Each structure stands twice: as structure tokens, then as C-alpha cells.
Amino acid sequence: NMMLFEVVKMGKSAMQSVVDDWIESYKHDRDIALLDLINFFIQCSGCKGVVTAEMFRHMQNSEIIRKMTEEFDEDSGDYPLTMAGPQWKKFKSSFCEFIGVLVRQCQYSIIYDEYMMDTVISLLTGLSDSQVRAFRHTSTLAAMKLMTALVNVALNLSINMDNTQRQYEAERNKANERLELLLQKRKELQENQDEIENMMNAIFKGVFVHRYRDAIAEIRAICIEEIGIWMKMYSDAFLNDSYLKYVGWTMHDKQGEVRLKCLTALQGLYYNKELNSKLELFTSRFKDRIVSMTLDKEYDVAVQAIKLLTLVLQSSEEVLTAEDCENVYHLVYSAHRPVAVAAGEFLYKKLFSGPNANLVKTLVFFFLESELHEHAAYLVDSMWDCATELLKDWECMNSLLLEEEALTDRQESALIEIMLCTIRQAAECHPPVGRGTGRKVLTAKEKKTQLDDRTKITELFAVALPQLLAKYSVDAEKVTNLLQLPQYFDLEIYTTGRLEKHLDALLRQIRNIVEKHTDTDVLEACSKTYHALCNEEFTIFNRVDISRSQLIDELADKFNRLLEDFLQEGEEPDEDDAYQVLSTLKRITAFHNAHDLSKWDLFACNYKLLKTGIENGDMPEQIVIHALQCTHYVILWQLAKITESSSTKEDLLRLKKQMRVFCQICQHYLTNVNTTVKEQAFTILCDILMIFSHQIMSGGRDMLEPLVYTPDSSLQSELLSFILDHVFIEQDDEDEASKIEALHKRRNLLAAFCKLIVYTVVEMNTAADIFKQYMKYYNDYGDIIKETMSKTRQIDKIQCAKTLILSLQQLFNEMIQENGYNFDRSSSTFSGIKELARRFALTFLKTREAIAMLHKDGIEFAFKEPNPQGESHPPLNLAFLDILSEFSSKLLRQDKRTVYVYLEKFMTFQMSLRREDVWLPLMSYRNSL
Amino acid sequence: SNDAYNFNLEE
Amino acid sequence: KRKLIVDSVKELDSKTIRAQLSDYSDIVTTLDLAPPTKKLMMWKETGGVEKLFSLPAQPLWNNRLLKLFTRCLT
């Protein structure tokens, strides 16, 4: 009835209670009970029809199923097993538990009465042949959940017949009429076994072999999942090629959910860890497919292929080739962390199996042999979870770099990189960029371990870092990495530990590095390290403050001496002289970024340098770019100090002259022919122009009104001109890594200008020359332009729309200069302009005034220029109308006719009487309204 | 049996 | 006509199954490597429109200065 199906969806019951209640009904009347059961399977398909006693007695299953299809009386296409929500997932569980419990509770008597099982198998083996998906998905599930129950029964039977065989041979070896009864029990049990096989052979041949190849993947995944279960539970009987092959073929299925269940089902046969010989022969045939699935289009399947392959390492034979293992190793560098750590486990097991000395060396050789990544951040992240024993053994690493086969230069360089990221990921207890999921909060145990490790690192390397620096003081790569540890130290340990001696040693090593190395990144680390250590809230400030002031005193005095001769009017300096000037300028520039060097007043020093490059045109580019940076930092650090209302009044006005003349200086160098000089002037200008924008005042900072600076038309054009010449360039359609880095540079420059657009330092009309590049440069700059389009729409939608049409007006104008006025409206170029307009249209409450103004402008632009030869002949730009009709879809009903009266002021009636080709723009626009 | 898996002979 | 879902094709031809066995190129792909250079790593965290439109073009390494720029956002 409704009752038996209802009982199962919200049972909150021991399904054994339902089964046992049913079995008792079966004993009182078999046919009444079976009819309840037949119907139960039919309502589990959402059927709503009822099988009657009459049907049960005289109708074949084929006829019943047909009658149930007609009487299905569905409200929709859904059926129980396709509903969403936990409550319905619980129904599926209840559905499967009832089937399994029912069989198992009957396994000792009822199941052999040649009536129940056969009747259910028949209905289910025919509902699984139905074109009605509901009847087929549901019956196929039930059939597999019945087979697995009958696999359990045959297993018990096999167990009990072995026990019976044991007692029989026991009685014979050592009373005769017991031997007779024991053999009649062995006869009975074989008769039982044959009946269970017959049943199983009819749910396999009648359902499986026909539904593992269903078209509904959810029905194919059901079948593969459960064959895996049979081979796992009754390995002796089902784990052979005759059953494995179905998983072997179906892992070529084109649906990921099905491929997944194949791997799962095979993982279960390997987690057994019974080292099966027949499974070993299957995996030789399908080894190559399984390895390839590590790069399955679905990452979830790829994780399981890797994990299956790690369990294959237990296999007695060497089944995987060298090639296979190296393809897995590469995946430690994958973007998807689930894949990377699965490969990490593979790497760990296969190759990892002080004491850890050679373990560390092997990791270094692996990293060097894997020519895919230059850093080890991702390598470390891949093995944080498994090899945490090794990656945090800093005593072993520090000793490998000092205490005497040896380590090569490349190996010491890689060991420093590896060690650096292990320290990074331990201090900042989170993964590298691209491997994390939104920085989830840490366990109490995790936070403890963050503490435990940070003291270990600080204790050790506060002593050892001075030693490493001294040994590798000459290798840039090595020192650039080493100088970044301080940012993770625990500042209070430097005092509690009586370590002031090592800090002095460190500070001296840094100074000798500053004096010798010029690598822009070596010097960046030195400056950021000093900034990290110059925290006024820790006990070591005045110590590091003293060494810092000593360092700048040397550099500033040397800088004066150098400039007094470099700029002496007759001492035409050569390359050697220039490199000396550049080496000190770089050091001053790096430190002036992170540190307040206002006291040394370097503003005039660089001004004389820059104006000389203007007058003579002879100045090395590296000198110019770093003088540009240092001046930028000089100005900003003053702007930071003048915040104080308790401040000198002359200084603030003095600054306006420091900034105003700097803008014209940069504007001059923006026209220079050297590219890196242009880029540098452009970036500093876009930053300066934002820092000094009107928004400098908002947060109660009304003092700074005199500092506001607004650019000229000349400057705005020069800035835009740079974007056109350096950003929107010919495109292809030194290989990837470099070409990505080049793109990111151009994106920075593009974002720099767009910041000025969405913040109204420049007229919004400038954005037209950008907005017209949306589709042409979608992949490269699409996201930046869309953000500019969104921010501008929020500020000024009518001005946004006015600039959008201007973009299309310019695209139109470009085409007439290239193709000609008599262009083809079917051209691919004209096609793209109006599709660009169609996307523009979806960016449209106050949308009424904007779309209206857009048509007013687009109309003027169409009729702006008249024809040379004829008023009855067409205006020149009239074809623009068909572009503008891409917008009318968005227009309101009310203003469509108002726009027409406006259009009639422009169009004479002879024109509106025109229908010829050239005027097909008109009627197309007329059809719009 | 590697003739078992050969789907050219079907199941 | 009926909302009841009826499938015209139940099984998948043996011929289509042998094709799946012989060509799985459409269900495997290339390694999507993670930033392979320290600079590309840095460009991922500072990349993206959100970070790009809220941070200076010329990096400022002291937050005493970086503020001076973020002050001026809306």
C-alpha cells in the first residue's frame, strides 16, 4: 500500500522491525504479502499506480509494467531517487537497507521456497528493461542491492559448508550413522548453494551486463559501485577477470562520476592488502590507463588514480615503469593541492623508506631533476602532511651546509630555497598562493606547533644565519633567500637568550653585502629586513636604529663626494665612474622605500641628476630609474610626516613645488625613446596622481587642500598615448613563464591608468580608447576593463554610456579609414562592432536617462556629415544606426516614440520614403521601435 | 586470461 | 505530452564501448602547473582586479607609506 512505501521514507525505525513485520505477514498469506512487496518497488519509482490482486494472478510482468506506466499519474519528471536534500538521501539508504535486511533475514528458509526471490527478481529484472527511467533507475539499484545481499548469503553458505566438510572428515578419521547425516547436510547445503548461484546468475545476466552500459551514468555508476563491493566481500568467488573486466572497460567511460567509481572499487581490492595474484594480472593490462587517469579532466578522479597507484606499490612485482613514476612525481607541482599531496604520498612511499642526511640530499636531487619549478614552495606544500618529520629537521639542514662526497654550488642553492619555504610554511601556518582554501582557522594543537617551531627556528638560525651568510656572502641567489628569514623570527628571543653578539655579527654581514652586491633583489631584502627589525615596540630598536643611522651616514657622505665630481663641469664620467654612482644610488633607493630617510634630505641630490639627463641626454637608464624611485620615496615620506598638525608650516607649501616640478620632469621623460624609462615615469605618475587626488582629504584631512593637483590636458593625452603604444599592441595568436610575466607588467600599467579613470582624476571620455578594446583584448585585459566599466557605471551611468558609444564611434571611424566609406555591412569587422555593442547593452534605476542620451549622441554621429553627392543620397555615417539598434532592445516602451520625433528633426521625408540598400540601416532601426 | 578482457570477443 | 521521462536508447552500443577503449584523449588533459617562478607566485597574490585596483603600481614596502595610498579609496 501507501503504507509500506511510507514506512520507509520517515521510518525512524530499525528496518529489521519492518522486515520482520513483513515476514510474519508472508507466513500468514504469501500472495497478500508479495503483492504488498511488488507494489512497494513500484511506488519507490514514484509510480502512484496500484497492482491489484487480479493483476497479480493473471498478468505477466510486461503487462503490469505497461499498466503502471499509463497509471503513473505523475505531476512532473522527478522520481524519488532524483530528489535533493538529506531527507531523500535517507530514503535511498532506507530503500537499500530494507532490501538487504529482507534477504538476509530470509537466508535460512524462506529464500529457498522457490516463490519469494523468483517473484522479486522477475519484477526487478523486467522493470530494469523498461524505457521508463524511473522504473529502470530504481529497479537497477534494488537489483544490485539484492545481489550484494545474495553474495553475503553464498559466502555464509560457503563458510558453513567448509565447517561441515571439516566435521565430516573428522568423524571418518576417527559412529557411522553420523557420517550419513553429515553427508545429507552436505547434500542439502550444495542444493542451497546451487539455488543461490542460479539467483545471482540471473540478476547478473538479466540486469548487470545490460545496465553497466546504460545511457544514464547514474545507472552505470550504480552497477560499477556494487560489483566492486561483491569482489571486495567475497574475493574468492567474484574477484577474477570474469568480473574485473567490467571495471576495466568502464574506466574508459566518458563520465567522471563513473570513472571515479571504478577507481574506488579497485582501491577497495588493494586496501585488502591480501596481495591477490589475479588482481595483479588485471593491473598489468590496465596499468597504462590508470596512470593516464592521474591527468583525468576531472580532478577528483585524478586524485583517486594517484591514490590507487600508491596502493599498487604494495604489489609484489615492479608493475610501474620508470616513466610512470616520473609522470606522477611531476604532479607535486600541480595547482590542485588534492592532486599535489596525493602525488606527494606516492613520492614519499617510493623514495623515502644526522640520520635524515641522505633523505635531505634525495629531496634536493629530486627538486633539481624536476625542471618544472625554480622554487620549492609547492614541493614543500605537497609533502607538508606526510613528510613533516623530515621537512622540519633544521638541525640536519644547517649541518649539511657547514660540516663537511660534498654539496655542489647548485645543491647548496637549492637547499637554501627548500629550507626557506619549510620555515615559511611553518611560521605562517598556511599553504602557498594557489594551494590554500580561504585560510581556515587553526587548531589549538596547530597553534601550539606554530609556537613550538618558531622558537626552534629563531633559537637556531639566530646563531647559524651569521655563519651561513659568511660562507655564501658572495652568492646573490643564496643571500636573497637567506635575508628573508628575519621576517619570521620571534623578536623577544633575541634578548631573553643573550644573543646580542650574533645580532651584531648579522648586522655586519648585511653591511658588507650592501657594500659589495648590487642585485636589485639582494638590496630589496636588505631593506625589508631592516624594516622588519626596526619595530619600535621591541627591545632591540635602538640597537638596530644605531647601525641604520651609521649606514646612511656613510652612503649619504659618499653620495655627496660622488656628485661633487660626477657633476663637476668637465669630468665627463665613463662607465666605471657611473657604475660607482649607480651602486650607491641603488642602495639608497632600496632603503628609502621602507625607511624614513627625510633627515638626510636627498631631494636636491636627485633633482640635479634628473635635470642633467634632460639637458645633455647622457644618463645611464639604471641611474634614471632609481633616481626616479628615490625621489618618489623622498616625496612620499615627507607627505607622511606632514600629516602632523603639530608640524612646520613652511614645509607643507614647500612641498607643492617639490611635487609640481616633479610632474613636469616625469612628463618630459614619458616622451623619451627608452622604454624602461617611460614605464618608470608612467607608474610613478599614476601613483602620484592618486595619492594627491581629492580623496586625500576625506577622512577629516581637510588640512591638505592646498596640496591637491589636477593634471593638464597635455598630461592626460600623454598618459593615454602611452597606453595605446605600450598596452594595446599587436598580439601573436621567451615562452610561457616570461610571456606571462610580460602580460602582468602591462596589466599593472593598464590598472594604473584605470585607477585614475574610476576615481575621476581624468575625464571619463578617456576610457573610450580603452572600452573599445574589450573584446579585442578580452583574455589579456578583459577583467580590468570590465571592472572599469562597473565602477564607472556606479559613479556616472549617463557619462559611462556617453563614453561607451564614443568607443563604438571610434571603432566605426577606424574602419572607414581602413576599408572605406562604402564598407560592407556583412564584413567581419562591422559584425564585431555591433556585437561589442550588444554586450555593452547588457551593462544597463536611472537607466532611462542614460540609454536616452546614448541614442541622442549616436543619432547626431550618424547624420553629422552629409553626402557629397545628394540630399536624396545618404548621410555619410548613416550605417551607424544598425549598431545602435543593438541597444533598443533595452529601451523602455515610453521613450521609443519620443526618440523618433527627435530623429524626424534630422531626417527629411524623402529619406524616410527611401527603402533601397544603402538605407537598410534606417529600416532596421525603424523596426526597432 | 588476457583474452578475457578483449572486448572484441564481447563479454 | 507526458512529463514522465522515457529513454528511447537504454544501452550504449558495443561499438561505442570499443571506441571509448581506443581513444580517451578527450578525458585527459595537460598539467596545470602552479606558479613556477617566485615572481609569478608573487604576481598571483598581488594579481587579480581586486588587488590591482586597491594597491599602488610601484610597491611600497612600509605600511606607513602604503596607508597614504589606501587612504584615498572611496
How many of the other CB atoms lie within 10 Å of CB of C37? 15
Q: What letter does residue C28 receive in the DSSP assignment?
A: B
Is C28 within 8 Å of chain B by CB?
Answer: no
* Contact (CB, 8 A) for A241 and A232: no
In chain A, residues preceding a discontinuity (C to N beyond 2.5 A) are 174, 353, 404, 733, 844
| Phi, psi (degrees; rounded to nearest 5) at C28 | -125, 160
Please, is A402 exposed, middle or buried when counting C-beta atoms within 10 Å of its C-beta (0-12, 13-18, 19+)? exposed
What are the distances in angstroms from CA A892 to CA A284, A789, A839, A843? 68, 22, 18, 15
**Are A296 and C28 an interchain contact pair (Cβ–Cβ within 8 Å)?**
yes
Cα(A471)–Cα(A461) distance, rounded to whole angstroms? 14
> Is the CB of C14 inside 8 Å of chain B's CB atoms?
yes
Experimental method: X-ray
A558: left (phi over 0), alpha (psi -120 to 50) or beta: alpha
- Residue A100's domain spans which residues? 1-929
Domain edges within chain C: 1-74
Per the listing, cell 651569521 goes with A466
Pick the residue of A205, A285, A288, A289 with the most B CBs within 10 A to test the interface with B by mutation.
A285
Is residue A148 within 8 Å of residue A199, measured between CB atoms?
Answer: no
**At A794, is the secondary structure helix, strand, or coil?**
helix
CA distances from A293 to A332, A749, B7 (A): 15, 41, 20
Burial class (CB in 10 A: 0-12, 13-18, 19+), A443: exposed
Report C:31-70 residues touching A (Cβ under 8 A): 31-41, 43-45, 47-49, 52-53, 56-62, 64-65, 68-69
Sequence-distant (≥ 6) Cβ neighbours of residue A82 within 8 angstroms: A137
First and final CA of chain C: distance in angstroms? 57
The whole-angstrom distance between residue A35's C-alpha and the CA centroid of its chain comes to 54
Q: Which amino acid is at A880?
A: F
* Helix, strand, or coil (residue C11): strand
The string over A741-764, giving b where at least 16 C-beta atoms fall within 10 Å of a residue's C-beta and e elsewhere, is eeebebbbbbbbbbbbbbbebbeb
Nearest CB to A335; choose among C5, C34, C69: C34
Nearest Cα neighbor of A490 from A513, A458, A518 is A458
Cell 520507509 belongs to residue:
A8
Among all chains, which residue has been given the C-alpha cell 609547492?
A378
Binary contact (C18, B10; C-beta < 8 A): no
With left for phi above 0 and alpha for psi between -120 and 50, is residue A871 left, alpha or beta? Answer: alpha
Q: For residue B2, which residues of chain A lie inside 8 Å, CB to CB?
A: 281, 285
Mutate to test the interface with C, among A246, A593, A778 (most CBs of C within 10 A): A593
Asked whether the beta carbons of A392 and A426 are under 8 A apart, the reply is yes
Question: Which chain A residues are within 8 Å of B11, Cβ to Cβ?
Answer: 209, 245
CA distance B5 to chain A (A): 5
CB A534 within 8 A of CB A598: no
Alpha carbon A347 to chain centroid distance?
Answer: 24
Report whether A172 contacts A186 (CB < 8 A): no
Chain B closest-CA separation from residue C18 CA (Å) = 7
Which amino acid type is present at position A183? L
C28 strand-pairing partners: A296
Could you tell me which of A39, A43, A21, A20 has the C-alpha nearest to residue A31? A39
Closest CA to A624 of A606, A597, A604, A602: A606
Place of cell 609522470: A327
- Distance to chain B for C27, nearest Cα, Å: 20
For residue A242, list chain B residues with Cβ-Cβ distance below 8 A.
Answer: 4
A132 strand-pairing partners:
C6
CA A296, CA A837: separation in Å to the nearest integer?
Answer: 39
Chain C residues touching B8 at Cβ < 8 A = 18
Question: How far is Cα A788 from Cα A770, in angstroms, rounded to an integer?
Answer: 9
Q: Is A820 left (phi over 0), alpha (psi -120 to 50) or beta?
A: left
- Cα–Cα separations (whole angstroms), residue A632 to A15, A244, A626, A685, A741: 77, 71, 10, 9, 24
**Which residues of chain C does B7 touch, with a Cβ-Cβ cutoff of 8 Å?**
14, 17-18, 21
d(CA A10, CA A656): 78
Contacts 24+ apart (CB under 8 A), A837-846: A837/A808, A837/A883, A837/A884, A837/A886, A837/A887, A838/A886, A839/A774, A839/A775, A840/A804, A840/A808, A840/A886, A840/A887, A841/A886, A841/A887, A841/A889, A841/A890, A843/A789, A843/A793, A843/A800, A843/A804, A844/A801, A844/A890, A846/A797
Long-range contacts formed by A52-58: CB under 8 A, 24+ apart: A56/A31
Could you tell me if residue A393 is left (phi over 0), alpha (psi between -120 and 50 degrees) or otherwise beta? beta
β strands within A639-717, DSSP E: none
> What is the C-alpha to C-alpha distance for residues C69 and C60, in angstroms, rounded to an integer?
9
- Please state, in angstroms and rounded to a whole number, the distance separating the CA atoms of residues C37 and C43: 10
- Nearest CB partner across the interface for C12, out of A213, A333, A531: A213
Residue-wise DSSP of A470-535: HHSTT-HHHHHHHTTSGGGS-TTHHHHTT-HHHHHHHHHHHHHHHHH---HHHHHHHHHHHHHH--
Which candidate in C15, C21, C22 is best for mutational testing of the B interface (most B CBs within 10 A)?
C21
Contacts of A285 in chain B (CB under 8 A): 2, 5
Residue A626, phi then psi, degrees to nearest 5:
-80, -30
Chain C residue numbers with beta carbons less than 8 Å from the beta carbon of A258 are none
Using DSSP's 3-state secondary structure scheme, residue A439 falls into: coil
Which cell is A604 given?
A: 636636491
Please write down the long-range contacts of A276-279, taking CB distance under 8 Å and 24 or more positions apart: A276/A235, A276/A239, A278/A239, A278/A240, A278/A241, A278/A244, A279/A239, A279/A244
CA atoms within 13 A on the CB side of A826: 1
Residue A68's CB: how many other CB atoms inside 10 A?
Answer: 23
Angle between helices A322-330 and A337-351 (to 10 degrees): 140
DSSP code string of A110-155: GGGSSSHHHHHHHHHHHHTT-SBHHHHHHHHHHHHHHHHHHHHHHH
Return the number of other C-beta atoms located less than 10 Å from residue A210's C-beta.
16
- Are B4 and A245 in contact (CB < 8 Å)? yes
Question: Cβ of A285 and B2 within 8 Å?
Answer: yes
3-state secondary structure A404-422: CCCCCHHHHHHHHHHHHHH
Partners of A784 on chain C (C-beta within 8 Å) are: 49, 52
Among candidates A347, A443, A335, A441, which has minimal Cα distance to A387? A347
Alpha carbons C53 and C73: distance in angstroms, whole number: 9
Is there a contact between A447 and A433 (Cβ–Cβ < 8 Å)? no
B7 at C interface, C-beta within 8 A = yes
Burial of A616 (0-12, 13-18, 19+ CB in 10 A): exposed
Determine the Cα–Cα distance for residues C30 and A674; give it in Å rounded to an integer.
Answer: 39
Other Cβ atoms less than 10 A from the Cβ of A107: the count is 19
* C-alpha dihedral sign at A325, A330, A336, A342: positive
Grid cell at residue A346: 606516492
Q: Name the resolution in angstroms.
A: 3.2
With beta carbons less than 8 A apart as the criterion, state whether A6 and A92 touch.
Answer: no
The reply to whether residue A132 touches residue C6, judged by beta carbons under 8 angstroms, is yes
Residue type, A216: I
What gap in Å lies between CA A752 and CA A748, rounded to an integer? 6
Question: Do A492 and A529 contact (CB within 8 A), yes or no?
Answer: no
Alpha-carbon span A426 to A780, nearest angstrom: 36
Q: Which is nearest to A103 in space by CA: A169, A54, A174, A152? A: A152
User: What is the DSSP code string of A581-623?
Assistant: HHHHHHHHHHHHHHS--GGG--HHHHHHHHHHHHHH----HHH
If one counts the domains in chain A, the total is: 1
Concatenating the DSSP letter of every residue in A817-867 gives: HHT-SS--TTSHHHHHHHHHHHHHHTT----HHHHHHHHHHHHHHHHSS--
- Tell me which H or E stretch contains A649: helix A649-670
Give me A824's grid cell. 560592407
- Location of C-alpha cell 641603488: A586
Helix, strand, coil abundance in chain C, percent, nearest 5 = 45, 5, 50
> CB distance B2–A245 less than 8 Å?
no
Please give the backbone phi and psi of residue A132, each rounded to the nearest 5 degrees, phi first.
-70, 115
Amino acid at C59: P
What is chain B's alpha carbon radius of gyration, rounded to the nearest angstrom? 6
d(CA A204, nearest CA chain C) in Å: 15
What is each CA distance from A12 to A49, A91, A228, in whole angstroms? 26, 11, 30
**8 Å CB contact of A252 and C20:** yes
CA nearest B3 in A: which residue? A241
Q: After which residues is chain C broken (C to N over 2.5 A)?
A: none
Q: Give the number of residues written for chain B.
A: 11
Note whether A704 and A758 are within 8 A (CB).
no
